[PDB]
Amino acid sequence: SMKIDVVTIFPEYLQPVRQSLPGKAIDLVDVAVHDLRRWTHDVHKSVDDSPYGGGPGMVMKPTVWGDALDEICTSETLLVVPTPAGYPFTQETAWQWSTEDHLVIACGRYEGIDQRVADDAATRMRVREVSIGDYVLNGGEAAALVIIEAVLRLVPGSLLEGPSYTRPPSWRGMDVPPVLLSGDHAKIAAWRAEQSRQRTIERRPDLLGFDS
Amino acid sequence: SMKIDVVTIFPEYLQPVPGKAIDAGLVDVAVHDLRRWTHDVHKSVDDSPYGGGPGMVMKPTVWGDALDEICTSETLLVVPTPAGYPFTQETAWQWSTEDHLVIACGRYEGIDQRVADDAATRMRVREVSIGDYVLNGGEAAALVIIEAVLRLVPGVSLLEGPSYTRPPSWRGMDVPPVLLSGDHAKIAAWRAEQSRQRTIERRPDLL
Ligand SMILES: OC1NC=Nc2cccc(F)c21
Numbered sequence A: 001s002m003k004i005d006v007v008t009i010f011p012e013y014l015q016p017v018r019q020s021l022p023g024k025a026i027d028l029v030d031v032a033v034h035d036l037r038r039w040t041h042d043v044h045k046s047v048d049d050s051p052y053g054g055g056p057g058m059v060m061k062p063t064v065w066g067d068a069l070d071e072i073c074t075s076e077t078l079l080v081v082p083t084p085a086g087y088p089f090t091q092e093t094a095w096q097w098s099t100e101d102h103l104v105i106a107c108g109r110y111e112g113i114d115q116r117v118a119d120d121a122a123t124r125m126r127v128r129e130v131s132i133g134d135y136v137l138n139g140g141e142a143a144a145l146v147i148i149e150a151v152l153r154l155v156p157g158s159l160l161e162g163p164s165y166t167r168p169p170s171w172r173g174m175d176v177p178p179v180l181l182s183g184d185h186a187k188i189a190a191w192r193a194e195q196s197r198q199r200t201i202e203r204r205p206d207l208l209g210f211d212s
Numbered sequence B: 001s002m003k004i005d006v007v008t009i010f011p012e013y014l015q016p017v018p019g020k021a022i023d024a025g026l027v028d029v030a031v032h033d034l035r036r037w038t039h040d041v042h043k044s045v046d047d048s049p050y051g052g053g054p055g056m057v058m059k060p061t062v063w064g065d066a067l068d069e070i071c072t073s074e075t076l077l078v079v080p081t082p083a084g085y086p087f088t089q090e091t092a093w094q095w096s097t098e099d100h101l102v103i104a105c106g107r108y109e110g111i112d113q114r115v116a117d118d119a120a121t122r123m124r125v126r127e128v129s130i131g132d133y134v135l136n137g138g139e140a141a142a143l144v145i146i147e148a149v150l151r152l153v154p155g156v157s158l159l160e161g162p163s164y165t166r167p168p169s170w171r172g173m174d175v176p177p178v179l180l181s182g183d184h185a186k187i188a189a190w191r192a193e194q195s196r197q198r199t200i201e202r203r204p205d206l207l
């Protein structure tokens, strides 16, 4: 079943852990992590350089990424490039990728990878540039972990959730809502619906088609 | 000064996030195993949901004890949850100036609501989601939050368009010549148009 390759200059940060949702799956999926510097040939193992046209920071070189993806990818590969400028990664995306035979995730710095890498790959395989949110990360590594977790839990083998409770029924003078103790499946369903409504309207009005 | 305490039943997951000079006292991250605060020999952290339904809910007595020991009145308690307010860059900026963050990592189904409600009577509590996809638990979200916050700690809109570096020609593709023109006003305008087109294509919501 599914193969996931992750390419990064911080392979220890990805390093698959038994005691993980992904770790259990590994013990249905195979996850391999590759050090990008493996495909460098200068003594300094240089993966980036200053941007053409100017600007702050560095851009990852196309040469190294090309050699790396040449080796790892096939025409059947779905190449995932986490980036702040990507299409939104959503739950629909997770379901779609959950049926893929082979995901390769290219982790780069925020400033990004030379655009020609994605352009070149697209001539040979499917390429998806995606953002997991509008906060700013220093690199794609944490995004890769999020994507893997969201995808792996869907592999064979709307409205916000309201508040949940468990035992004891009273705790620090705070009681569980009595309807939840009443065993009335209908009243419980109605209460839960109303709680989710209040919470969605308050926290995520966008989900119900309202202004933010 | 910034102290981050993370509480999780997967402490090894959180160890990875090295990172810089704590020797200057700018940033300390401590990860705590939630099972430290369990009451029974089976080290139980969750229980069946009241009112029925699938999954488990994390126990209030365990989390209550953990937060009692870890938190103070000055703490900003962060609770990652799919039902949370959106975590944004503005949020990250605000939290970057906090003396003490405690991140309570729970499973998707959640922590008994009384835990957060109780904590909010003596400290600031923030329930947040990092996105509208489903994770099994809050650990990955904590990593995302920790990264977005700490890079704004010193010493630790439109989409950006394509970027390029050497060599000028690679596998049949040349860098856009405008970028080599030495006309920096034109370069800015070109980049603005690239940004416009990419935003329209990928994130029309931003407009
Ligand atoms: O999805 C993101 N959101 C914010 N920053 C990033 C930096 C690198 C990769 C990536 F996917 C992201």
Ligand SMILES: OC1NC=Nc2cccc(F)c21
Pocket (backbone or CB within 6 Å): B080, B081, B082, B106, B107, B108, B128, B129, B130, B131, B132, B133, B134, B135, B136, B137, B138, B139, B141
């Ligand atoms: O499923 C999620 N989606 C977004 N944020 C989260 C934060 C904590 C736990 C969790 F499951 C999630």
